[PDB]
Write a protein that binds this ligand. Sequence first.
Ligand code: BEF
Ligand code: BEF
Ligand SMILES: [Mg+2]
Ligand SMILES: [Mg+2]
Lengths: 129, 122, 81, 90
Amino acid sequence: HHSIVKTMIVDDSAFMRNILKRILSTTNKYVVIGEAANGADAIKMAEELQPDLISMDIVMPETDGITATKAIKEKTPEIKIVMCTSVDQEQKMIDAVNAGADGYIVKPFQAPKILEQFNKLFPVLFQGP
Amino acid sequence: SIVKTMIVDDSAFMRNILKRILSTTNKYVVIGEAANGADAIKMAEELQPDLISMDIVMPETDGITATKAIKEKTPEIKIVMCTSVDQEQKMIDAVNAGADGYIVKPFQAPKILEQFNKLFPV
Amino acid sequence: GDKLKNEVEQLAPEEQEILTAIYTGITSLELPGMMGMDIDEVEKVLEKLIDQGFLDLVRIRKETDLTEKGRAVTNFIITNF
Amino acid sequence: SEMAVESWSGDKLKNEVEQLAPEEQEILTAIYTGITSLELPGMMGMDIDEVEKVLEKLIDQGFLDLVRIRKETDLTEKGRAVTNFIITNF
Ligand code: BEF
Ligand code: BEF
Ligand SMILES: [Mg+2]
Ligand SMILES: [Mg+2]
């Protein structure tokens, strides 16, 4: 229904993960149900927690975010994954979209832009007055 | 843990206080707001919430009757009274109507969460 | 006794709502978004209620915006995050 | 506009950026994203006065400007009693 979006934040920077938590906390729909510090944990946690949405950094230990995006998507294609990374090279970005990424935000980002990003994948759905 | 939460109070500013407090939590999603009893009973049937913040003194239907109507229509809904009424008799009626918690306003924010977290623990 | 009740009666709804908000624990900072009010107007009401003794100025906090220097530095340091 | 991006070329920036402490780099990244300067101490494990000291340096260091000044106010025992008197209004 999109009134509640189980969200999973994947970034090796704890501070950046904390950034995305303040932003999503003020919203009435995005509930951070998990955090992964590396892509290998991102793969497993998405497997176990089945989030509706994953904010996915790219440059991370153990396994990158594009490899994580792809591996999560061939098990759970229903999961929406939005790359949240500082890599702005258009190639990596083509690679992310080809891996399954539904979104791509470049750090530094402004909070309304990433909610505007997230809200396209999970819009407010009106059934009528 | 996600608690679909419904806020029932005739004071708009008080539903606002209760929403702002539940916003900082990573648990409570306020999915509905009722300004009186009558609307709280049928909205509770609409949304099937996990938790209702229930005032008593309200324009159309009191919170006790609303609680009572919702509880043995939908007993799984945890109902917590949140109110300026401290008279023990009205309290007794709330608990006997089926209420699971009771907050006396004016309240502190950590105690709003303490009733709610007590009914949906981490 | 008489001074307070005239003050309580002269306390407009906005001021009653503020006082109720701080009691609950709502910091004086996120009051404007809760009342649909300008941040500058709410701060003048706070200044009205400290002078009349309903509130005490605990701490003075600054709200800040990045300079173009700031945004340039953030753009540079971002790979650390 | 974009003039500032060019005016702050890489050579000049690194001197001030290497000056900045890791925490101070965190205030800026958070403030950029939109997290208010009222919102950091509860997010950075820092006491509110340390943040305010750090903010005032970044306004002195030139990285920040002072949009407005915010009051942290608590109820006097008068106001605590007033709230308990007007609670029936809500
Ligand atoms: F480390 Be992330 F790709 F910004
Ligand atoms: F509005 Be009162 F707290 F019943
Ligand atoms: Mg990284
Ligand atoms: Mg009432």
